Ligand binder design. Structure first.
Ligand SMILES: CCNC(=O)CSc1nnc(C(C)C)o1
Ligand SMILES: [Mn+2]
Ligand SMILES: [Mn+2]
Lengths: 137, 137
């Protein structure tokens, strides 16, 4: 039986700028780094950054919709998003199709998101404003 | 302040086989489905499958090391790996690290892993046998 996400591993092209992005800019906790990677946590999430010569800096129009959303409180959401904007962090999406979200890119173009709300809250919102053809189980 | 992973969204080329893989083969709970996606849970993980015509069925040699690991107990690991093997699910890597790991591909080539063990367990092993250049914080 699978019980959740054990870890998220992101391939990165340049380790130090990626560590700085996740630790300094996003505020995650850095636990260890080595010549080819780093381990961070964000709450319960174990994030691994893995130096990969295959990773390319990818513009958002070249990648699919696969993305990683991080939880933030309603009280903190807007000022965190505005700080990322003021820091020049690139974006990839503007239309809020899944609630209160801010869509931004990491240095390699990994698609990230700040989101306010749980799955239960999103299901409740969708009952009122459902996506086309939506069925609830 | 970011408090954890809010959700993981995977772009999928065909919704029905992806729902079958995550719900039926991998045992995740299907909460909702609409014409262009689905919401599932796996423990605390909120997973979204998003139908995306830009998703390519991608051979593992053509994607980088970015991957998504799910937690499973040691006791359940071998029978779950055998289930994936019976279903013909391809493996993209052999395990050479601490903690059991099974590295397998989803229908679109998303790189997945079953892993036994926490960040704390990994850090303890690393303290005893540090990787090249390893620093702790
Ligand atoms: C399947 C259950 N997992 C999730 O809903 C992850 S997002 C999530 N979980 N708690 C929260 C807070 C905003 C209350 O947000
Ligand atoms: Mn999202
Ligand atoms: Mn892994």
């Amino acid at each position: 039986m699978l019980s959740g996400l054990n870890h998220l591993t992101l391939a990165v092209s340049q380790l130090a700028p990626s560590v700085a992005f996740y630790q300094q800019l996003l505020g995650m906790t850095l636990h260890a780094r080595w010549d080819s990677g780093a381990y961070l946590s964000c709450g319960d999430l174990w994030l691994c950054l893995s130096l990969d010569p295959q990773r390319r800096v990818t513009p958002p129009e070249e990648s699919d919709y696969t993305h990683y959303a991080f939880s933030i409180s309603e009280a903190d959401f807007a000022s965190f998003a505005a700080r990322l904007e003021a820091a020049g962090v690139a974006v990839w999406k503007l239309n809020r199709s899944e609630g209160a979200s801010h869509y931004f890119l990491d240095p390699d173009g990994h698609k990230l998101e700040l989101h306010v709300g749980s799955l239960a809250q999103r299901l409740a919102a969708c009952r009122e404003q459902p996506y086309k053809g939506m069925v609830f189980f």
